[PDB]
PDB file of all heavy atoms in Angstrom:
ATOM      1  N   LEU A   1     -18.573 -13.572  -0.377  1.00 33.86           N
ATOM      2  CA  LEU A   1     -17.656 -14.158   0.594  1.00 33.86           C
ATOM      3  C   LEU A   1     -18.235 -15.463   1.118  1.00 33.86           C
ATOM      4  O   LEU A   1     -19.196 -15.436   1.901  1.00 33.86           O
ATOM      5  CB  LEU A   1     -17.401 -13.187   1.748  1.00 33.86           C
ATOM      6  CG  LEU A   1     -16.522 -13.705   2.888  1.00 33.86           C
ATOM      7  CD1 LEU A   1     -15.137 -14.067   2.376  1.00 33.86           C
ATOM      8  CD2 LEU A   1     -16.431 -12.678   4.007  1.00 33.86           C
ATOM      9  N   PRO A   2     -17.704 -16.620   0.719  1.00 30.97           N
ATOM     10  CA  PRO A   2     -18.238 -17.888   1.228  1.00 30.97           C
ATOM     11  C   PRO A   2     -17.652 -18.264   2.580  1.00 30.97           C
ATOM     12  O   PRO A   2     -16.867 -17.506   3.157  1.00 30.97           O
ATOM     13  CB  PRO A   2     -17.833 -18.891   0.142  1.00 30.97           C
ATOM     14  CG  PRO A   2     -16.553 -18.335  -0.394  1.00 30.97           C
ATOM     15  CD  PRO A   2     -16.649 -16.828  -0.290  1.00 30.97           C
ATOM     16  N   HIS A   3     -18.030 -19.432   3.092  1.00 32.45           N
ATOM     17  CA  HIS A   3     -17.474 -19.928   4.343  1.00 32.45           C
ATOM     18  C   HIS A   3     -16.034 -20.374   4.116  1.00 32.45           C
ATOM     19  O   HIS A   3     -15.758 -21.177   3.221  1.00 32.45           O
ATOM     20  CB  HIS A   3     -18.315 -21.083   4.882  1.00 32.45           C
ATOM     21  CG  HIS A   3     -19.771 -20.759   5.010  1.00 32.45           C
ATOM     22  ND1 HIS A   3     -20.291 -20.083   6.093  1.00 32.45           N
ATOM     23  CD2 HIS A   3     -20.818 -21.017   4.190  1.00 32.45           C
ATOM     24  CE1 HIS A   3     -21.595 -19.938   5.934  1.00 32.45           C
ATOM     25  NE2 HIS A   3     -21.939 -20.497   4.788  1.00 32.45           N
ATOM     26  N   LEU A   4     -15.120 -19.848   4.924  1.00 33.47           N
ATOM     27  CA  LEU A   4     -13.696 -20.056   4.718  1.00 33.47           C
ATOM     28  C   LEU A   4     -13.155 -21.124   5.660  1.00 33.47           C
ATOM     29  O   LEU A   4     -13.606 -21.264   6.801  1.00 33.47           O
ATOM     30  CB  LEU A   4     -12.925 -18.749   4.922  1.00 33.47           C
ATOM     31  CG  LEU A   4     -13.365 -17.565   4.057  1.00 33.47           C
ATOM     32  CD1 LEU A   4     -12.451 -16.370   4.275  1.00 33.47           C
ATOM     33  CD2 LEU A   4     -13.403 -17.956   2.588  1.00 33.47           C
ATOM     34  N   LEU A   5     -12.169 -21.874   5.173  1.00 30.54           N
ATOM     35  CA  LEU A   5     -11.477 -22.885   5.963  1.00 30.54           C
ATOM     36  C   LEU A   5      -9.985 -22.720   5.716  1.00 30.54           C
ATOM     37  O   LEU A   5      -9.457 -23.225   4.721  1.00 30.54           O
ATOM     38  CB  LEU A   5     -11.946 -24.295   5.595  1.00 30.54           C
ATOM     39  CG  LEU A   5     -11.126 -25.472   6.128  1.00 30.54           C
ATOM     40  CD1 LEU A   5     -11.264 -25.592   7.636  1.00 30.54           C
ATOM     41  CD2 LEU A   5     -11.540 -26.762   5.441  1.00 30.54           C
ATOM     42  N   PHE A   6      -9.312 -22.006   6.613  1.00 30.84           N
ATOM     43  CA  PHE A   6      -7.879 -21.757   6.497  1.00 30.84           C
ATOM     44  C   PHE A   6      -7.132 -22.916   7.146  1.00 30.84           C
ATOM     45  O   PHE A   6      -7.071 -23.012   8.377  1.00 30.84           O
ATOM     46  CB  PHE A   6      -7.506 -20.428   7.150  1.00 30.84           C
ATOM     47  CG  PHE A   6      -7.992 -19.222   6.396  1.00 30.84           C
ATOM     48  CD1 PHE A   6      -8.016 -17.976   7.001  1.00 30.84           C
ATOM     49  CD2 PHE A   6      -8.420 -19.331   5.083  1.00 30.84           C
ATOM     50  CE1 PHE A   6      -8.461 -16.863   6.313  1.00 30.84           C
ATOM     51  CE2 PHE A   6      -8.866 -18.221   4.391  1.00 30.84           C
ATOM     52  CZ  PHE A   6      -8.886 -16.986   5.006  1.00 30.84           C
ATOM     53  N   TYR A   7      -6.566 -23.793   6.324  1.00 31.62           N
ATOM     54  CA  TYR A   7      -5.827 -24.951   6.806  1.00 31.62           C
ATOM     55  C   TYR A   7      -4.345 -24.764   6.520  1.00 31.62           C
ATOM     56  O   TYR A   7      -3.957 -24.465   5.387  1.00 31.62           O
ATOM     57  CB  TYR A   7      -6.336 -26.238   6.149  1.00 31.62           C
ATOM     58  CG  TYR A   7      -5.388 -27.411   6.264  1.00 31.62           C
ATOM     59  CD1 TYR A   7      -5.340 -28.179   7.419  1.00 31.62           C
ATOM     60  CD2 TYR A   7      -4.550 -27.758   5.212  1.00 31.62           C
ATOM     61  CE1 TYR A   7      -4.478 -29.253   7.528  1.00 31.62           C
ATOM     62  CE2 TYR A   7      -3.685 -28.830   5.311  1.00 31.62           C
ATOM     63  CZ  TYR A   7      -3.653 -29.575   6.470  1.00 31.62           C
ATOM     64  OH  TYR A   7      -2.794 -30.645   6.574  1.00 31.62           O
ATOM     65  N   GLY A   8      -3.518 -24.935   7.547  1.00 30.63           N
ATOM     66  CA  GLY A   8      -2.094 -24.772   7.374  1.00 30.63           C
ATOM     67  C   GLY A   8      -1.269 -25.010   8.622  1.00 30.63           C
ATOM     68  O   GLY A   8      -1.791 -25.154   9.732  1.00 30.63           O
ATOM     69  N   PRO A   9       0.049 -25.051   8.453  1.00 31.12           N
ATOM     70  CA  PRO A   9       0.948 -25.288   9.589  1.00 31.12           C
ATOM     71  C   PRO A   9       0.981 -24.087  10.518  1.00 31.12           C
ATOM     72  O   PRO A   9       0.534 -22.992  10.146  1.00 31.12           O
ATOM     73  CB  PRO A   9       2.316 -25.511   8.920  1.00 31.12           C
ATOM     74  CG  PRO A   9       2.027 -25.722   7.466  1.00 31.12           C
ATOM     75  CD  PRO A   9       0.778 -24.964   7.179  1.00 31.12           C
ATOM     76  N   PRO A  10       1.495 -24.253  11.736  1.00 30.16           N
ATOM     77  CA  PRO A  10       1.572 -23.115  12.659  1.00 30.16           C
ATOM     78  C   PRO A  10       2.549 -22.059  12.165  1.00 30.16           C
ATOM     79  O   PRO A  10       3.574 -22.370  11.554  1.00 30.16           O
ATOM     80  CB  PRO A  10       2.050 -23.752  13.970  1.00 30.16           C
ATOM     81  CG  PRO A  10       1.759 -25.211  13.829  1.00 30.16           C
ATOM     82  CD  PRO A  10       1.915 -25.511  12.375  1.00 30.16           C
ATOM     83  N   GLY A  11       2.220 -20.800  12.438  1.00 30.45           N
ATOM     84  CA  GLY A  11       3.078 -19.693  12.076  1.00 30.45           C
ATOM     85  C   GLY A  11       3.040 -19.288  10.620  1.00 30.45           C
ATOM     86  O   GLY A  11       3.953 -18.587  10.168  1.00 30.45           O
ATOM     87  N   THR A  12       2.018 -19.700   9.871  1.00 30.49           N
ATOM     88  CA  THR A  12       1.900 -19.340   8.465  1.00 30.49           C
ATOM     89  C   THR A  12       1.116 -18.054   8.240  1.00 30.49           C
ATOM     90  O   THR A  12       1.250 -17.448   7.172  1.00 30.49           O
ATOM     91  CB  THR A  12       1.242 -20.478   7.677  1.00 30.49           C
ATOM     92  OG1 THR A  12       0.057 -20.912   8.355  1.00 30.49           O
ATOM     93  CG2 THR A  12       2.201 -21.649   7.537  1.00 30.49           C
ATOM     94  N   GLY A  13       0.311 -17.626   9.207  1.00 28.70           N
ATOM     95  CA  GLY A  13      -0.407 -16.374   9.083  1.00 28.70           C
ATOM     96  C   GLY A  13      -1.886 -16.524   8.798  1.00 28.70           C
ATOM     97  O   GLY A  13      -2.449 -15.756   8.015  1.00 28.70           O
ATOM     98  N   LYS A  14      -2.530 -17.513   9.422  1.00 28.16           N
ATOM     99  CA  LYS A  14      -3.966 -17.691   9.243  1.00 28.16           C
ATOM    100  C   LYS A  14      -4.757 -16.762  10.158  1.00 28.16           C
ATOM    101  O   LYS A  14      -5.681 -16.072   9.710  1.00 28.16           O
ATOM    102  CB  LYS A  14      -4.351 -19.149   9.500  1.00 28.16           C
ATOM    103  CG  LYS A  14      -3.796 -20.129   8.482  1.00 28.16           C
ATOM    104  CD  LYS A  14      -3.963 -21.561   8.958  1.00 28.16           C
ATOM    105  CE  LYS A  14      -3.190 -21.805  10.244  1.00 28.16           C
ATOM    106  NZ  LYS A  14      -3.295 -23.221  10.692  1.00 28.16           N
ATOM    107  N   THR A  15      -4.407 -16.739  11.446  1.00 30.07           N
ATOM    108  CA  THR A  15      -5.091 -15.857  12.386  1.00 30.07           C
ATOM    109  C   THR A  15      -4.876 -14.394  12.020  1.00 30.07           C
ATOM    110  O   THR A  15      -5.816 -13.593  12.062  1.00 30.07           O
ATOM    111  CB  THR A  15      -4.608 -16.128  13.811  1.00 30.07           C
ATOM    112  OG1 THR A  15      -4.765 -17.520  14.113  1.00 30.07           O
ATOM    113  CG2 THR A  15      -5.408 -15.307  14.810  1.00 30.07           C
ATOM    114  N   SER A  16      -3.646 -14.030  11.656  1.00 28.05           N
ATOM    115  CA  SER A  16      -3.377 -12.664  11.219  1.00 28.05           C
ATOM    116  C   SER A  16      -4.181 -12.324   9.972  1.00 28.05           C
ATOM    117  O   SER A  16      -4.726 -11.220   9.850  1.00 28.05           O
ATOM    118  CB  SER A  16      -1.881 -12.480  10.967  1.00 28.05           C
ATOM    119  OG  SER A  16      -1.112 -13.061  12.006  1.00 28.05           O
ATOM    120  N   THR A  17      -4.278 -13.272   9.035  1.00 32.11           N
ATOM    121  CA  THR A  17      -5.038 -13.031   7.813  1.00 32.11           C
ATOM    122  C   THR A  17      -6.508 -12.786   8.117  1.00 32.11           C
ATOM    123  O   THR A  17      -7.098 -11.823   7.614  1.00 32.11           O
ATOM    124  CB  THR A  17      -4.886 -14.210   6.851  1.00 32.11           C
ATOM    125  OG1 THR A  17      -3.536 -14.271   6.376  1.00 32.11           O
ATOM    126  CG2 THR A  17      -5.830 -14.061   5.666  1.00 32.11           C
ATOM    127  N   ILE A  18      -7.117 -13.635   8.947  1.00 30.00           N
ATOM    128  CA  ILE A  18      -8.540 -13.467   9.219  1.00 30.00           C
ATOM    129  C   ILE A  18      -8.798 -12.223  10.069  1.00 30.00           C
ATOM    130  O   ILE A  18      -9.828 -11.558   9.901  1.00 30.00           O
ATOM    131  CB  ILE A  18      -9.126 -14.737   9.863  1.00 30.00           C
ATOM    132  CG1 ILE A  18     -10.652 -14.650   9.920  1.00 30.00           C
ATOM    133  CG2 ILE A  18      -8.552 -14.968  11.252  1.00 30.00           C
ATOM    134  CD1 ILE A  18     -11.295 -14.314   8.591  1.00 30.00           C
ATOM    135  N   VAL A  19      -7.870 -11.860  10.960  1.00 28.42           N
ATOM    136  CA  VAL A  19      -8.045 -10.645  11.749  1.00 28.42           C
ATOM    137  C   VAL A  19      -7.962  -9.414  10.855  1.00 28.42           C
ATOM    138  O   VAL A  19      -8.794  -8.505  10.954  1.00 28.42           O
ATOM    139  CB  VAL A  19      -7.013 -10.595  12.889  1.00 28.42           C
ATOM    140  CG1 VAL A  19      -6.882  -9.179  13.429  1.00 28.42           C
ATOM    141  CG2 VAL A  19      -7.409 -11.554  14.001  1.00 28.42           C
ATOM    142  N   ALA A  20      -6.967  -9.367   9.964  1.00 25.88           N
ATOM    143  CA  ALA A  20      -6.871  -8.253   9.028  1.00 25.88           C
ATOM    144  C   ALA A  20      -8.068  -8.212   8.087  1.00 25.88           C
ATOM    145  O   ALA A  20      -8.512  -7.127   7.698  1.00 25.88           O
ATOM    146  CB  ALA A  20      -5.571  -8.346   8.232  1.00 25.88           C
ATOM    147  N   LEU A  21      -8.616  -9.376   7.733  1.00 25.41           N
ATOM    148  CA  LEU A  21      -9.800  -9.404   6.883  1.00 25.41           C
ATOM    149  C   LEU A  21     -11.008  -8.821   7.601  1.00 25.41           C
ATOM    150  O   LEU A  21     -11.750  -8.013   7.027  1.00 25.41           O
ATOM    151  CB  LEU A  21     -10.088 -10.836   6.436  1.00 25.41           C
ATOM    152  CG  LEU A  21     -11.291 -10.938   5.505  1.00 25.41           C
ATOM    153  CD1 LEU A  21     -11.039 -10.076   4.285  1.00 25.41           C
ATOM    154  CD2 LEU A  21     -11.565 -12.381   5.116  1.00 25.41           C
ATOM    155  N   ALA A  22     -11.230  -9.223   8.853  1.00 25.66           N
ATOM    156  CA  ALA A  22     -12.337  -8.663   9.619  1.00 25.66           C
ATOM    157  C   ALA A  22     -12.146  -7.168   9.848  1.00 25.66           C
ATOM    158  O   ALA A  22     -13.119  -6.405   9.873  1.00 25.66           O
ATOM    159  CB  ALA A  22     -12.484  -9.402  10.947  1.00 25.66           C
ATOM    160  N   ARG A  23     -10.894  -6.731  10.010  1.00 25.98           N
ATOM    161  CA  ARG A  23     -10.620  -5.303  10.145  1.00 25.98           C
ATOM    162  C   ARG A  23     -10.966  -4.553   8.865  1.00 25.98           C
ATOM    163  O   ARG A  23     -11.569  -3.476   8.911  1.00 25.98           O
ATOM    164  CB  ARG A  23      -9.154  -5.080  10.514  1.00 25.98           C
ATOM    165  CG  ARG A  23      -8.806  -5.455  11.943  1.00 25.98           C
ATOM    166  CD  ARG A  23      -8.810  -4.235  12.848  1.00 25.98           C
ATOM    167  NE  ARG A  23      -7.994  -4.445  14.040  1.00 25.98           N
ATOM    168  CZ  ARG A  23      -6.674  -4.294  14.077  1.00 25.98           C
ATOM    169  NH1 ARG A  23      -6.015  -3.931  12.985  1.00 25.98           N
ATOM    170  NH2 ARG A  23      -6.012  -4.506  15.206  1.00 25.98           N
ATOM    171  N   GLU A  24     -10.584  -5.105   7.711  1.00 22.45           N
ATOM    172  CA  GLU A  24     -10.939  -4.491   6.437  1.00 22.45           C
ATOM    173  C   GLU A  24     -12.443  -4.497   6.195  1.00 22.45           C
ATOM    174  O   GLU A  24     -12.959  -3.581   5.546  1.00 22.45           O
ATOM    175  CB  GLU A  24     -10.218  -5.210   5.294  1.00 22.45           C
ATOM    176  CG  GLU A  24     -10.423  -4.582   3.925  1.00 22.45           C
ATOM    177  CD  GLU A  24      -9.214  -4.745   3.024  1.00 22.45           C
ATOM    178  OE1 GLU A  24      -8.245  -3.973   3.181  1.00 22.45           O
ATOM    179  OE2 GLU A  24      -9.232  -5.647   2.160  1.00 22.45           O
ATOM    180  N   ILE A  25     -13.153  -5.496   6.710  1.00 25.95           N
ATOM    181  CA  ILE A  25     -14.594  -5.602   6.492  1.00 25.95           C
ATOM    182  C   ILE A  25     -15.365  -4.630   7.374  1.00 25.95           C
ATOM    183  O   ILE A  25     -16.221  -3.883   6.893  1.00 25.95           O
ATOM    184  CB  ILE A  25     -15.060  -7.055   6.725  1.00 25.95           C
ATOM    185  CG1 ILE A  25     -14.584  -7.964   5.593  1.00 25.95           C
ATOM    186  CG2 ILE A  25     -16.574  -7.115   6.844  1.00 25.95           C
ATOM    187  CD1 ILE A  25     -15.112  -9.379   5.688  1.00 25.95           C
ATOM    188  N   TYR A  26     -15.079  -4.617   8.678  1.00 24.71           N
ATOM    189  CA  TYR A  26     -15.867  -3.838   9.624  1.00 24.71           C
ATOM    190  C   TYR A  26     -15.178  -2.577  10.122  1.00 24.71           C
ATOM    191  O   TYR A  26     -15.824  -1.772  10.799  1.00 24.71           O
ATOM    192  CB  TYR A  26     -16.248  -4.700  10.836  1.00 24.71           C
ATOM    193  CG  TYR A  26     -17.031  -5.941  10.473  1.00 24.71           C
ATOM    194  CD1 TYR A  26     -16.423  -7.189  10.465  1.00 24.71           C
ATOM    195  CD2 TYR A  26     -18.376  -5.864  10.137  1.00 24.71           C
ATOM    196  CE1 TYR A  26     -17.133  -8.326  10.133  1.00 24.71           C
ATOM    197  CE2 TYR A  26     -19.094  -6.997   9.803  1.00 24.71           C
ATOM    198  CZ  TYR A  26     -18.466  -8.226   9.802  1.00 24.71           C
ATOM    199  OH  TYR A  26     -19.175  -9.358   9.471  1.00 24.71           O
ATOM    200  N   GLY A  27     -13.902  -2.383   9.814  1.00 24.72           N
ATOM    201  CA  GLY A  27     -13.187  -1.218  10.291  1.00 24.72           C
ATOM    202  C   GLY A  27     -12.507  -1.472  11.623  1.00 24.72           C
ATOM    203  O   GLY A  27     -12.148  -2.598  11.978  1.00 24.72           O
ATOM    204  N   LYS A  28     -12.331  -0.384  12.377  1.00 23.42           N
ATOM    205  CA  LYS A  28     -11.752  -0.490  13.710  1.00 23.42           C
ATOM    206  C   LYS A  28     -12.720  -1.110  14.710  1.00 23.42           C
ATOM    207  O   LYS A  28     -12.333  -1.357  15.858  1.00 23.42           O
ATOM    208  CB  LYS A  28     -11.302   0.887  14.201  1.00 23.42           C
ATOM    209  CG  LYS A  28     -10.024   1.406  13.551  1.00 23.42           C
ATOM    210  CD  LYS A  28      -9.113   0.272  13.101  1.00 23.42           C
ATOM    211  CE  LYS A  28      -7.957   0.793  12.263  1.00 23.42           C
ATOM    212  NZ  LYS A  28      -7.236  -0.301  11.557  1.00 23.42           N
ATOM    213  N   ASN A  29     -13.963  -1.358  14.304  1.00 25.34           N
ATOM    214  CA  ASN A  29     -14.982  -1.960  15.153  1.00 25.34           C
ATOM    215  C   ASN A  29     -14.974  -3.485  15.094  1.00 25.34           C
ATOM    216  O   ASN A  29     -16.001  -4.108  15.385  1.00 25.34           O
ATOM    217  CB  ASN A  29     -16.361  -1.432  14.751  1.00 25.34           C
ATOM    218  CG  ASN A  29     -17.193  -1.010  15.940  1.00 25.34           C
ATOM    219  OD1 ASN A  29     -17.121  -1.612  17.012  1.00 25.34           O
ATOM    220  ND2 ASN A  29     -17.989   0.038  15.759  1.00 25.34           N
ATOM    221  N   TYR A  30     -13.846  -4.087  14.717  1.00 25.22           N
ATOM    222  CA  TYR A  30     -13.735  -5.530  14.528  1.00 25.22           C
ATOM    223  C   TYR A  30     -14.072  -6.312  15.793  1.00 25.22           C
ATOM    224  O   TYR A  30     -14.803  -7.306  15.734  1.00 25.22           O
ATOM    225  CB  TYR A  30     -12.323  -5.885  14.048  1.00 25.22           C
ATOM    226  CG  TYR A  30     -11.758  -7.161  14.637  1.00 25.22           C
ATOM    227  CD1 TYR A  30     -12.219  -8.405  14.228  1.00 25.22           C
ATOM    228  CD2 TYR A  30     -10.759  -7.118  15.601  1.00 25.22           C
ATOM    229  CE1 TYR A  30     -11.704  -9.571  14.763  1.00 25.22           C
ATOM    230  CE2 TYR A  30     -10.238  -8.279  16.142  1.00 25.22           C
ATOM    231  CZ  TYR A  30     -10.714  -9.502  15.719  1.00 25.22           C
ATOM    232  OH  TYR A  30     -10.198 -10.660  16.255  1.00 25.22           O
ATOM    233  N   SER A  31     -13.549  -5.872  16.938  1.00 25.14           N
ATOM    234  CA  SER A  31     -13.674  -6.634  18.177  1.00 25.14           C
ATOM    235  C   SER A  31     -15.107  -6.738  18.682  1.00 25.14           C
ATOM    236  O   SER A  31     -15.344  -7.448  19.665  1.00 25.14           O
ATOM    237  CB  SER A  31     -12.794  -6.012  19.263  1.00 25.14           C
ATOM    238  OG  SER A  31     -11.453  -6.455  19.149  1.00 25.14           O
ATOM    239  N   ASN A  32     -16.062  -6.059  18.048  1.00 23.05           N
ATOM    240  CA  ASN A  32     -17.442  -6.063  18.514  1.00 23.05           C
ATOM    241  C   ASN A  32     -18.420  -6.674  17.521  1.00 23.05           C
ATOM    242  O   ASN A  32     -19.415  -7.272  17.942  1.00 23.05           O
ATOM    243  CB  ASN A  32     -17.885  -4.635  18.847  1.00 23.05           C
ATOM    244  CG  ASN A  32     -17.274  -4.127  20.137  1.00 23.05           C
ATOM    245  OD1 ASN A  32     -17.268  -4.825  21.151  1.00 23.05           O
ATOM    246  ND2 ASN A  32     -16.743  -2.911  20.101  1.00 23.05           N
ATOM    247  N   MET A  33     -18.168  -6.542  16.221  1.00 22.14           N
ATOM    248  CA  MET A  33     -19.052  -7.087  15.201  1.00 22.14           C
ATOM    249  C   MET A  33     -18.677  -8.500  14.776  1.00 22.14           C
ATOM    250  O   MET A  33     -19.263  -9.020  13.820  1.00 22.14           O
ATOM    251  CB  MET A  33     -19.068  -6.172  13.970  1.00 22.14           C
ATOM    252  CG  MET A  33     -19.464  -4.735  14.264  1.00 22.14           C
ATOM    253  SD  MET A  33     -19.394  -3.690  12.796  1.00 22.14           S
ATOM    254  CE  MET A  33     -19.702  -2.079  13.515  1.00 22.14           C
TER     255      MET A  33
END
């Protein structure tokens, strides 16, 4: 997993994508790790 740069217009789903990615990586413990 390299350093990511999500570039795009508003409302395309960048924040949702990275949040779901961190959830898949760390589980339900996302908000702490």
Side-chain angles (χ1 to χ4, degrees):
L1 176 61
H3 307 278
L4 304 185
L5 168 69
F6 289 165
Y7 163 82
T12 49
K14 293 168 298 183
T15 306
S16 316
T17 292
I18 190 52
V19 162
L21 182 59
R23 287 263 203 82
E24 185 148 280
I25 288 185
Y26 302 104
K28 285 332 171 193
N29 226 325
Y30 141 73
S31 277
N32 286 314
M33 304 177 187

